[PDB]
């Protein structure tokens, strides 16, 4: 065969975690983790850098709950600075797991593009905790040059770069000096990249390959995109990602940007790809414009997502994420296994808060 | 370097090969072991769910030769009453104790020794120790406490889905292990937590280990059609536990209701919000009304008899020794169902 | 430690690779063998079902060059009457010039009478005797489970009593079963446990073998005895006929594609301003009212005459043989190379991304 | 036992892996070979179908850098007339179409389909100035095709000749040895095609391209991947596998330029789209049973807007792979095989689409 097929790649729906002997209840497990080599999270969730997901309200709530929000970059420098500053002056025992810097202020992230040094300058002055250098194709000279230039001017600024989906890409970014890599080419709910360009790696195999390489450098992996249910968070972490970035599951909350609207008797919010026409008009598109149901507060969403993670860790018998990653074992399943895993042969009559 | 230990299969992935047969479906024998010490005349058990089994369903299961497990979503006195109703019902296939009284089971959870005490005094035949995660310190310590206090009480524990878990429960002294993490029709465990094992591979793995102890395996959850029962027993389960196929019956708890011109009964997971009243592991639903348990069980056991006839098996143990499987594809599964023809008459065993 | 023999494939899992061809579809030969002793001029048999084959359908199947098998869900006198109607439709001494010009490929016995088959069950020796006396050309011994003592004993009794009667027996799905029936003296084995459109056996009993692998395994054993294999059930499209024959079947038995025709028994009816005929498994409750059912009761769209259906089915086979370069069915089996496909490959193979606005005569 | 040669994959079974890139999508080169002797500025060819390509579609495809193939479901004189219209096709146009695919005289290039043994048709198309003849059969790997290739190359040594369709390495070898200038690969993948269902014959398109490219490269002969392209990503996969150009039917059938009528049905505009082996197409020509259907596709506007989106997807793909040009694309490309769940992850999922996207239906 002329064509080079390197592996058969799996994603979340193709695998399940095996139960393990457990001496710990879900409410007892520890779910803190690392965002970067130098920044910890108290809970492993990050809200996506998207203009229908994270501005200051979402970033504040995510940090209060122990995680992180990344302010999107589809705004001018001054507006983004204003958003970072609003998170940073936000700060109450209602939030005992709040993720704070050494001064007691909430952590926040902010996204940047290739070559946007003036923006990096402004965000550093505004007190940003981590810069997220994002591009459709992180394994690129433009990205690596920007990494090198930022770490040369701000040696102690935590820098996350992405997105990537190969071991070669993880090595290249780790060698350029990043503090974490963000993995995900194509898995996003609103993403058409794989369909429009033919490029991508199914998300489980992409995490697995990139974690194996990035661990050789001590660099955490953020699993970005494709999370549909709380069970997918556990699988992403068990394969070895240090944290998970989520868009669609948070787009429908009070705190995300944009107003509620009603369609056919039910309430929704807009949710769209940053590579969709609408977002780019604020080169051919790699995302769509859509809607997601309204699901209330980020707090109630996060409670269900982490409840599922805790249940998963109790089933596996892990006391914390490190132990979860060391001892998780998987089985590969079939299409019929997946059908068996969902609800089947019964008509759901009541909504469940964690299953749609 | 992720640890995938196995490609795991479930019911729809496999079929039984026919073998040379000298037996007609009429003639095969379908008795089996529930526990090390209790035999069933038919290998079907109704699920311990508050939309499936109270006394009326348990009575009919035992009269037909199997067993009902009274659910534990009720206080102790209520469950004792349900047990006494079944034992008091009477005193050719009926599953009876040494006094001519129907046999019945009853579910308990961890740290419920007072419920065990009352159920034993009420004459329960078997206690079913029921957890979302059987392979845990709480369950193992509860098994050891029950067997130390009641050496001669048959104890079933679950649920599990690995060889290591079957070993642990068998070493602690259970009389049967119940296998099934995630296969249930109303179950969302695998979606909410990412954990589970497709039911065929889980039975296969647990049987191999439990056989070392002479301990039967109960295949719990995921049975959709009667062929699923045949497959589970052929792989080596000694009995099968069924929820959804029995919940739309006259005998299950709860009332008929009508929706869009046709009748239903509620059916819900014991880890759904409704049953527990939180991060649920089940949903609340409805199933079509299908008449009496008698007519359902007749169809289910009819399928099992046909299967044993096709395989040439005189009885369950011979069925397990003779069974050979093929793995099939999605195209093979579509070929197996009805295809390319519009069904006009609802068929008593295929829906 | 559960014993999985193999991964088994059915029609939609495979495709034939094109091969170098020097023949056009109108030039290929499609005659074949029904049994060791009976030839067909085309490779199609209508199912022994009370919604498919009674005398009218059997007369048409024979005129077109194949065979019809009269079902057995009737008393002996009624099945004799059906067989005689086929045997008396035509004869060597009656020069029906119309029928002889329209149907030049008609499949006839040595007296110039249309051939016909008839179904029997285990131990129905009285029915066999009456069918022989009626002039039946081949007896089809049907059971849900051909690989059984009851069937093998029936085969040995029939072959002892009528050594020259061609006898088909089924249904089977393993090589061991084919070996057992061939050693017992059958003239052809009929393969298919579970593939039928109206069949629920695999779902109700968990027992079956996907049809391509089942044919493949039984052909390899039956060929050792010179015994033809009949692929019975699960044919959805003309391409499935080609695949079945290419894998090694000598003929194919079809139910649902022939049930909605003028010639099948049963009356046209209308559902929501559309015409249908009934089509039901012989193991359905309706058919058995005459233990738990192994089929359903259904309807299929009315499609006109058996002639236009068969014309399309054989046109697809001829095309297939042209693509392989096969001059005849045995050449087809010796040339044929398959590929295994995926789910996406099956999607690609069907019509996709286009709304169909006209009925194609061979694609529904 | 039966002989299964391999497990065959098509477009939805595979994805391209990203590679290290120093190039942006607007900088990559998408020039490619049509035959041994003719190049395209862009690798797209409109299908030789009577609902896709007559002179108007061929003019636009050539103006955008590719090619149109005039279908053969018409008499010789009608097909000569369509070819002449393209060849007869002001100085502003040269500004607006700076990538036009022209012959030596500055006329738009055009192809035309012929059938087995149709030497009279070849003679008339050559005198009309056709740039390439596409010898097309349902079954290219046949004595009839092979003898016609030989007779055409004997009589017109300098006429570029594409032959198809094929799906195996043995077939590419036979056509290359008989002297074709490109082979066209595709048995069964077409949107409107029922060949694999009617006859059971075919090879999933990715494996078919891959097998034919390996053999045809030994003769320096380009492969045209014909059929089954649903999205722009499929074009990228086909080229990365080793195809030199891609032939497109359904994605161009609902354009202004395709022949046949815009009509409205239930508030939406469509155009007819049908297989050349459908009953309607063959009754036009007027015996073999059909190997295609008759349908309709939504109206999508101009060919230019469609082509812009398709090539934008190709450029993006080459940027992800790090490829500066098509040959570099093919050398660098590495694939993964995916599952049905992988394909579901790849599409839009768990969100309702509320706005039209120009490259994703
Ligand atoms: C602009 C657009 C539509 N596409 C690209 O920039 N494509 C792209 C860029 C570089 C290379 Cl070498 C190849 C392709 C975009 C915008 C915002 C987000 C994304 C996205 N896919 N994020 O994950 C994409
Ligand atoms: C309560 C709830 C919703 N979940 C759990 O208890 N989860 C759970 C328990 C222990 C551990 Cl270590 C991990 C997870 C439940 C209630 C009833 C039944 C089930 C069920 N999954 N099978 O019966 C679950
Ligand atoms: C009666 C019924 C419903 N089932 C059986 O007779 N079952 C059966 C027979 C023997 C053995 Cl050992 C095992 C199972 C039936 C009637 C007519 C046709 C079929 C059928 N499956 N044909 O392919 C089945
Ligand atoms: C006419 C028809 C329906 N079929 C054939 O000509 N079949 C065919 C020809 C030769 C051989 Cl040896 C085998 C089969 C057709 C018409 C137009 C296009 C096609 C088609 N499949 N193109 O790819 C087919
Ligand atoms: O339009 C785009 N094209 C491709 N990927 C995108 C686009 N916009 C956002 N993303 C990615 O999709 C992720 C969200 O995935 P989700 O959680 O599945 O909704 C984000 O964190 C980005 O990495
Ligand atoms: O809500 C729950 N979550 C997970 N599993 C459940 C829940 N409730 C009942 N089950 C299991 O599902 C089985 C019934 O499955 P069914 O026969 O497929 O409907 C029961 O016997 C239990 O083992
Ligand atoms: O009810 C039944 N159960 C199982 N198989 C049946 C039954 N009735 C007929 N068959 C088989 O199904 C075949 C027809 O399949 P079809 O062509 O796919 O509809 C017949 O030739 C029989 O072998
Ligand atoms: O009716 C037919 N039967 C089979 N293939 C056809 C027929 N008509 C056109 N084709 C092929 O299908 C291709 C178009 O496929 P599409 O781009 O997927 O719509 C054409 O270029 C031909 O190769
Ligand atoms: K489930
Ligand atoms: K079937
Ligand atoms: K097709
Ligand atoms: K996607």
Tab-separated table of C-alpha atoms in Angstrom, chain B:
chain	number	residue	atom	x	y	z
B	1	UNK	CA	0.737	4.007	26.914
B	2	UNK	CA	-2.868	3.604	28.028
B	3	UNK	CA	-3.796	0.186	29.397
B	4	UNK	CA	-6.470	-1.397	27.215
B	5	UNK	CA	-6.598	-4.951	28.518
B	6	UNK	CA	-9.220	-6.336	26.204
B	7	UNK	CA	-11.748	-5.858	23.422
B	8	UNK	CA	-14.978	-6.702	25.273
B	9	UNK	CA	-18.156	-8.024	23.642
B	10	UNK	CA	-21.828	-8.016	24.555
B	11	UNK	CA	-24.935	-9.954	23.480
B	12	UNK	CA	-25.454	-8.381	20.037
B	13	UNK	CA	-21.842	-9.129	19.048
B	14	UNK	CA	-22.206	-12.940	19.208
B	15	UNK	CA	-24.436	-15.820	18.112
B	16	UNK	CA	-24.570	-19.510	19.020
B	17	UNK	CA	-23.640	-22.044	16.334
B	18	UNK	CA	-26.134	-24.894	15.896
B	19	UNK	CA	-24.828	-28.353	16.685
B	20	UNK	CA	-25.945	-31.925	16.110
B	21	UNK	CA	-29.115	-32.521	18.123
B	22	UNK	CA	-31.079	-35.554	19.273
B	23	UNK	CA	-33.338	-33.550	21.607
B	24	UNK	CA	-36.485	-31.608	20.887
B	25	UNK	CA	-37.159	-28.301	22.681
B	26	UNK	CA	-39.941	-30.194	24.577
B	27	UNK	CA	-37.439	-32.509	26.146
B	28	UNK	CA	-34.618	-30.354	27.435
B	29	UNK	CA	-34.367	-29.653	31.146
B	30	UNK	CA	-33.917	-26.093	32.331
B	31	UNK	CA	-33.338	-26.399	36.082
B	32	UNK	CA	-30.233	-24.632	37.365
B	33	UNK	CA	-28.441	-23.428	40.510
B	34	UNK	CA	-29.321	-20.085	42.058
B	35	UNK	CA	-26.639	-20.378	44.753
B	36	UNK	CA	-24.357	-23.132	45.942
B	37	UNK	CA	-27.340	-24.433	47.953
B	38	UNK	CA	-30.561	-23.356	46.156
B	39	UNK	CA	-31.821	-24.745	42.846
B	40	UNK	CA	-34.268	-23.117	40.445
B	41	UNK	CA	-36.592	-25.036	38.145
B	42	UNK	CA	-36.201	-22.257	35.526
B	43	UNK	CA	-33.238	-19.839	35.354
B	44	UNK	CA	-35.088	-16.469	35.478
B	45	UNK	CA	-35.038	-13.976	38.384
B	46	UNK	CA	-37.046	-10.756	38.500
B	47	UNK	CA	-34.980	-7.662	39.318
B	48	UNK	CA	-34.906	-6.030	42.762
B	49	UNK	CA	-36.539	-2.830	41.527
B	50	UNK	CA	-39.456	-0.809	42.826
B	51	UNK	CA	-41.078	-0.952	39.365
B	52	UNK	CA	-40.585	-4.735	38.933
B	53	UNK	CA	-40.767	-6.923	42.059
B	54	UNK	CA	-43.039	-6.763	45.057
B	55	UNK	CA	-44.943	-9.807	46.369
B	56	UNK	CA	-47.271	-10.361	43.419
B	57	UNK	CA	-44.394	-10.610	40.919
B	58	UNK	CA	-42.287	-12.722	43.296
B	59	UNK	CA	-45.201	-15.143	43.741
B	60	UNK	CA	-45.606	-15.611	39.992
B	61	UNK	CA	-41.852	-15.982	39.394
B	62	UNK	CA	-41.678	-18.722	42.029
B	63	UNK	CA	-44.836	-20.471	40.803
B	64	UNK	CA	-43.252	-20.619	37.348
B	65	UNK	CA	-40.056	-22.115	38.867
B	66	UNK	CA	-37.777	-19.087	39.156
B	67	UNK	CA	-37.378	-16.410	41.813
B	68	UNK	CA	-38.355	-12.812	42.584
B	69	UNK	CA	-36.156	-10.472	44.638
B	70	UNK	CA	-38.156	-7.983	46.708
B	71	UNK	CA	-36.571	-4.526	46.314
B	72	UNK	CA	-35.197	-2.556	49.266
B	73	UNK	CA	-36.676	0.882	48.471
B	74	UNK	CA	-39.054	0.506	51.405
B	75	UNK	CA	-38.648	0.269	55.136
B	76	UNK	CA	-37.778	-3.034	56.798
B	77	UNK	CA	-41.311	-3.798	57.995
B	78	UNK	CA	-42.708	-3.308	54.486
B	79	UNK	CA	-40.146	-5.654	52.970
B	80	UNK	CA	-40.806	-8.258	55.674
B	81	UNK	CA	-44.504	-8.035	54.818
B	82	UNK	CA	-43.724	-8.612	51.139
B	83	UNK	CA	-41.598	-11.648	52.058
B	84	UNK	CA	-44.331	-13.089	54.281
B	85	UNK	CA	-46.945	-12.601	51.538
B	86	UNK	CA	-44.843	-14.743	49.188
B	87	UNK	CA	-44.127	-17.445	51.824
B	88	UNK	CA	-47.844	-17.527	52.777
B	89	UNK	CA	-49.225	-17.736	49.194
B	90	UNK	CA	-49.324	-21.546	49.372
B	91	UNK	CA	-47.953	-24.363	51.531
B	92	UNK	CA	-45.755	-28.536	38.541
B	93	UNK	CA	-42.555	-26.526	38.278
B	94	UNK	CA	-43.043	-24.308	41.329
B	95	UNK	CA	-39.879	-23.393	43.232
B	96	UNK	CA	-40.619	-24.338	46.841
B	97	UNK	CA	-38.742	-24.681	50.124
B	98	UNK	CA	-38.882	-27.767	52.341
B	99	UNK	CA	-42.346	-26.778	53.616
B	100	UNK	CA	-44.010	-26.409	50.222
B	101	UNK	CA	-43.737	-22.631	50.453
B	102	UNK	CA	-42.565	-20.615	47.463
B	103	UNK	CA	-38.981	-19.413	47.635
B	104	UNK	CA	-38.292	-15.657	47.650
B	105	UNK	CA	-35.307	-13.328	47.810
B	106	UNK	CA	-34.878	-9.850	49.242
B	107	UNK	CA	-32.379	-7.084	48.582
B	108	UNK	CA	-30.259	-5.340	51.243
B	109	UNK	CA	-27.513	-2.731	51.162
B	110	UNK	CA	-24.281	-2.270	53.086
B	111	UNK	CA	-24.464	-1.884	56.846
B	112	UNK	CA	-28.072	-3.056	56.977
B	113	UNK	CA	-27.669	-5.956	59.401
B	114	UNK	CA	-30.994	-5.164	61.069
B	115	UNK	CA	-32.760	-5.643	57.716
B	116	UNK	CA	-30.994	-9.014	57.288
B	117	UNK	CA	-32.115	-10.027	60.797
B	118	UNK	CA	-35.773	-9.270	60.090
B	119	UNK	CA	-35.723	-10.910	56.648
B	120	UNK	CA	-34.213	-14.130	58.058
B	121	UNK	CA	-36.869	-14.309	60.786
B	122	UNK	CA	-39.516	-13.760	58.080
B	123	UNK	CA	-38.185	-16.844	56.296
B	124	UNK	CA	-36.456	-15.272	53.299
B	125	UNK	CA	-34.731	-17.910	51.208
B	126	UNK	CA	-31.850	-15.769	49.971
B	127	UNK	CA	-30.509	-12.299	50.729
B	128	UNK	CA	-29.213	-10.257	47.777
B	129	UNK	CA	-26.507	-7.811	48.877
B	130	UNK	CA	-26.855	-5.033	46.354
B	131	UNK	CA	-24.356	-2.320	45.506
B	132	UNK	CA	-23.506	-0.158	42.553
B	133	UNK	CA	-19.939	-1.368	43.174
B	134	UNK	CA	-19.724	-4.815	44.694
B	135	UNK	CA	-15.921	-4.878	44.576
B	136	UNK	CA	-15.484	-2.618	47.569
B	137	UNK	CA	-14.485	-2.714	51.232
B	138	UNK	CA	-18.033	-1.991	52.417
B	139	UNK	CA	-19.502	-4.953	50.522
B	140	UNK	CA	-16.724	-7.370	51.433
B	141	UNK	CA	-16.960	-6.467	55.122
B	142	UNK	CA	-20.748	-6.867	54.911
B	143	UNK	CA	-20.447	-10.336	53.327
B	144	UNK	CA	-18.098	-11.425	56.106
B	145	UNK	CA	-20.444	-10.128	58.808
B	146	UNK	CA	-23.499	-11.873	57.358
B	147	UNK	CA	-21.784	-15.227	56.917
B	148	UNK	CA	-20.293	-15.088	60.421
B	149	UNK	CA	-23.714	-14.438	61.926
B	150	UNK	CA	-25.797	-16.565	59.527
B	151	UNK	CA	-23.584	-19.440	58.290
B	152	UNK	CA	-26.485	-21.213	56.577
B	153	UNK	CA	-28.127	-18.197	54.900
B	154	UNK	CA	-27.639	-18.136	51.134
B	155	UNK	CA	-26.019	-14.841	50.216
B	156	UNK	CA	-25.796	-13.297	46.766
B	157	UNK	CA	-23.594	-10.255	46.325
B	158	UNK	CA	-23.037	-7.773	43.499
B	159	UNK	CA	-22.624	-6.104	41.242
B	160	UNK	CA	-19.267	-6.863	39.732
B	161	UNK	CA	-17.737	-7.048	36.281
B	162	UNK	CA	-14.153	-8.395	36.700
B	163	UNK	CA	-12.406	-11.646	37.620
B	164	UNK	CA	-10.652	-9.890	40.528
B	165	UNK	CA	-14.034	-8.883	41.947
B	166	UNK	CA	-15.477	-12.410	41.637
B	167	UNK	CA	-12.427	-13.756	43.464
B	168	UNK	CA	-12.862	-11.195	46.247
B	169	UNK	CA	-16.546	-11.953	46.825
B	170	UNK	CA	-15.986	-15.715	46.622
B	171	UNK	CA	-13.109	-15.569	49.120
B	172	UNK	CA	-15.352	-13.599	51.466
B	173	UNK	CA	-17.905	-16.427	51.331
B	174	UNK	CA	-20.793	-15.469	48.995
B	175	UNK	CA	-23.035	-18.203	47.612
B	176	UNK	CA	-23.486	-16.497	44.216
B	177	UNK	CA	-22.061	-13.423	42.486
B	178	UNK	CA	-24.195	-11.076	40.445
B	179	UNK	CA	-22.548	-9.667	37.313
B	180	UNK	CA	-23.416	-6.430	35.545
B	181	UNK	CA	-21.936	-2.923	35.669
B	182	UNK	CA	-23.768	-0.682	33.229
B	183	UNK	CA	-25.744	-3.012	30.890
B	184	UNK	CA	-29.188	-2.214	32.320
B	185	UNK	CA	-31.827	-0.707	30.051
B	186	UNK	CA	-32.391	2.174	32.529
B	187	UNK	CA	-28.713	2.491	33.521
B	188	UNK	CA	-26.449	5.494	32.821
B	189	UNK	CA	-23.457	4.407	34.948
B	190	UNK	CA	-21.211	3.941	31.927
B	191	UNK	CA	-22.107	7.333	30.527
B	192	UNK	CA	-22.015	9.251	33.761
B	193	UNK	CA	-18.868	7.582	35.122
B	194	UNK	CA	-17.182	6.046	32.066
B	195	UNK	CA	-17.044	2.678	33.897
B	196	UNK	CA	-18.415	-0.706	32.899
B	197	UNK	CA	-17.805	-3.940	31.059
B	198	UNK	CA	-19.965	-5.166	28.140
B	199	UNK	CA	-22.101	-7.906	29.572
B	200	UNK	CA	-20.939	-10.999	27.621
B	201	UNK	CA	-17.266	-10.378	28.352
B	202	UNK	CA	-18.116	-9.570	31.987
B	203	UNK	CA	-20.027	-12.836	32.441
B	204	UNK	CA	-17.215	-14.707	30.688
B	205	UNK	CA	-14.554	-13.205	32.965
B	206	UNK	CA	-16.512	-13.669	36.152
B	207	UNK	CA	-17.628	-17.256	35.419
B	208	UNK	CA	-14.083	-18.485	34.948
B	209	UNK	CA	-13.095	-17.246	38.364
B	210	UNK	CA	-16.299	-18.078	40.226
B	211	UNK	CA	-16.183	-21.638	38.851
B	212	UNK	CA	-12.937	-22.162	40.812
B	213	UNK	CA	-15.049	-21.751	43.976
B	214	UNK	CA	-18.119	-23.641	42.760
B	215	UNK	CA	-20.072	-20.356	42.970
B	216	UNK	CA	-22.864	-19.600	40.444
B	217	UNK	CA	-22.995	-16.406	38.363
B	218	UNK	CA	-26.198	-14.386	37.945
B	219	UNK	CA	-26.141	-12.375	34.688
B	220	UNK	CA	-27.894	-9.105	35.641
B	221	UNK	CA	-29.006	-6.494	33.140
B	222	UNK	CA	-29.052	-5.925	29.401
B	223	UNK	CA	-31.390	-8.782	28.417
B	224	UNK	CA	-33.536	-7.532	25.532
B	225	UNK	CA	-34.824	-10.717	23.902
B	226	UNK	CA	-34.977	-14.374	24.868
B	227	UNK	CA	-31.872	-15.169	22.782
B	228	UNK	CA	-29.926	-12.931	25.205
B	229	UNK	CA	-30.931	-15.363	27.980
B	230	UNK	CA	-29.656	-18.345	25.965
B	231	UNK	CA	-26.386	-16.532	25.256
B	232	UNK	CA	-25.809	-15.605	28.915
B	233	UNK	CA	-26.368	-19.169	30.142
B	234	UNK	CA	-24.276	-20.633	27.296
B	235	UNK	CA	-21.340	-18.434	28.282
B	236	UNK	CA	-21.651	-19.899	31.762
B	237	UNK	CA	-24.045	-17.890	33.897
B	238	UNK	CA	-26.295	-20.122	35.989
B	239	UNK	CA	-29.243	-17.721	35.990
B	240	UNK	CA	-30.340	-14.400	34.557
B	241	UNK	CA	-31.933	-11.376	36.244
B	242	UNK	CA	-34.461	-9.356	34.260
B	243	UNK	CA	-35.933	-5.899	34.820
B	244	UNK	CA	-37.331	-4.226	31.698
B	245	UNK	CA	-38.927	-7.336	30.158
B	246	UNK	CA	-41.021	-7.813	33.320
B	247	UNK	CA	-41.882	-4.222	34.272
B	248	UNK	CA	-44.781	-3.761	31.865
B	249	UNK	CA	-46.670	-6.726	33.378
B	250	UNK	CA	-49.883	-6.948	35.381
B	251	UNK	CA	-47.921	-8.216	38.375
B	252	UNK	CA	-45.281	-5.488	38.634
B	253	UNK	CA	-45.917	-2.663	41.120
B	254	UNK	CA	-47.501	0.492	39.824
B	255	UNK	CA	-50.510	1.321	37.713
B	256	UNK	CA	-51.243	1.211	34.018
B	257	UNK	CA	-51.546	4.592	32.360
B	258	UNK	CA	-52.359	5.682	28.829
B	259	UNK	CA	-50.216	7.856	26.567
B	260	UNK	CA	-51.044	8.705	22.910
B	261	UNK	CA	-53.686	6.017	22.797
B	262	UNK	CA	-51.848	3.048	24.243
B	263	UNK	CA	-50.854	1.654	27.588
B	264	UNK	CA	-47.680	1.770	29.652
B	265	UNK	CA	-46.214	1.213	33.101
B	266	UNK	CA	-43.463	3.248	34.724
B	267	UNK	CA	-40.001	1.742	34.789
B	268	UNK	CA	-37.099	3.495	36.443
B	269	UNK	CA	-33.576	2.901	37.621
B	270	UNK	CA	-33.005	2.493	41.328
B	271	UNK	CA	-30.289	5.155	40.936
B	272	UNK	CA	-32.631	7.603	39.198
B	273	UNK	CA	-33.745	10.806	40.893
B	274	UNK	CA	-37.293	9.499	41.286
B	275	UNK	CA	-36.295	6.250	42.994
B	276	UNK	CA	-33.797	7.966	45.298
B	277	UNK	CA	-36.306	10.592	46.465
B	278	UNK	CA	-27.693	14.111	43.773
B	279	UNK	CA	-25.806	12.753	40.747
B	280	UNK	CA	-27.987	9.904	39.416
B	281	UNK	CA	-26.949	6.729	37.649
B	282	UNK	CA	-30.315	5.861	36.095
B	283	UNK	CA	-33.308	7.403	34.350
B	284	UNK	CA	-37.073	7.396	34.861
B	285	UNK	CA	-39.038	5.933	31.966
B	286	UNK	CA	-41.981	3.901	30.678
B	287	UNK	CA	-42.392	0.515	28.973
B	288	UNK	CA	-45.376	-0.853	26.981
B	289	UNK	CA	-47.934	-2.928	28.840
B	290	UNK	CA	-47.410	-6.557	27.813
B	291	UNK	CA	-49.893	-8.527	29.912
B	292	UNK	CA	-49.084	-11.121	32.593
B	293	UNK	CA	-45.662	-12.365	33.697
B	294	UNK	CA	-46.955	-15.849	32.836
B	295	UNK	CA	-47.169	-15.023	29.135
B	296	UNK	CA	-43.805	-13.222	29.128
B	297	UNK	CA	-41.978	-16.059	30.914
B	298	UNK	CA	-43.581	-18.643	28.623
B	299	UNK	CA	-42.092	-16.848	25.615
B	300	UNK	CA	-38.694	-16.348	27.269
B	301	UNK	CA	-38.328	-20.004	28.300
B	302	UNK	CA	-39.633	-21.070	24.894
B	303	UNK	CA	-36.714	-19.271	23.302
B	304	UNK	CA	-34.254	-20.910	25.701
B	305	UNK	CA	-35.675	-24.371	24.901
B	306	UNK	CA	-35.372	-23.743	21.162
B	307	UNK	CA	-31.775	-22.598	21.671
B	308	UNK	CA	-30.906	-25.737	23.638
B	309	UNK	CA	-32.613	-27.790	20.935
B	310	UNK	CA	-30.494	-26.116	18.222
B	311	UNK	CA	-27.341	-26.765	20.252
B	312	UNK	CA	-28.243	-30.376	21.054
B	313	UNK	CA	-28.180	-29.878	24.840
B	314	UNK	CA	-30.126	-32.099	27.257
B	315	UNK	CA	-29.724	-29.612	30.142
B	316	UNK	CA	-28.017	-26.332	31.065
B	317	UNK	CA	-24.681	-27.882	32.014
B	318	UNK	CA	-24.522	-29.801	28.729
B	319	UNK	CA	-25.554	-26.569	26.945
B	320	UNK	CA	-22.564	-24.748	28.444
B	321	UNK	CA	-20.147	-27.549	27.498
B	322	UNK	CA	-21.438	-27.792	23.915
B	323	UNK	CA	-21.864	-24.094	23.135
B	324	UNK	CA	-19.689	-22.569	20.438
B	325	UNK	CA	-20.066	-18.932	19.349
B	326	UNK	CA	-19.379	-16.776	16.334
B	327	UNK	CA	-18.671	-13.068	16.500
B	328	UNK	CA	-20.799	-11.035	14.072
B	329	UNK	CA	-20.797	-7.540	12.582
B	330	UNK	CA	-23.367	-4.748	12.461
B	331	UNK	CA	-24.501	-6.092	9.070
B	332	UNK	CA	-24.919	-9.548	10.609
B	333	UNK	CA	-27.026	-8.101	13.418
B	334	UNK	CA	-29.319	-6.333	10.951
B	335	UNK	CA	-29.685	-9.623	9.058
B	336	UNK	CA	-30.629	-11.349	12.338
B	337	UNK	CA	-33.536	-9.012	13.129
B	338	UNK	CA	-36.573	-8.661	10.927
B	339	UNK	CA	-35.559	-6.670	7.869
B	340	UNK	CA	-37.102	-5.238	4.693
B	341	UNK	CA	-40.683	-6.183	5.702
B	342	UNK	CA	-43.244	-4.084	7.597
B	343	UNK	CA	-44.543	-5.945	10.674
B	344	UNK	CA	-48.349	-5.919	10.776
B	345	UNK	CA	-49.105	-8.212	13.765
B	346	UNK	CA	-47.426	-7.765	17.085
B	347	UNK	CA	-45.538	-11.011	17.792
B	348	UNK	CA	-45.513	-12.313	21.358
B	349	UNK	CA	-41.724	-12.684	21.584
B	350	UNK	CA	-40.330	-10.007	19.238
B	351	UNK	CA	-40.863	-6.275	19.568
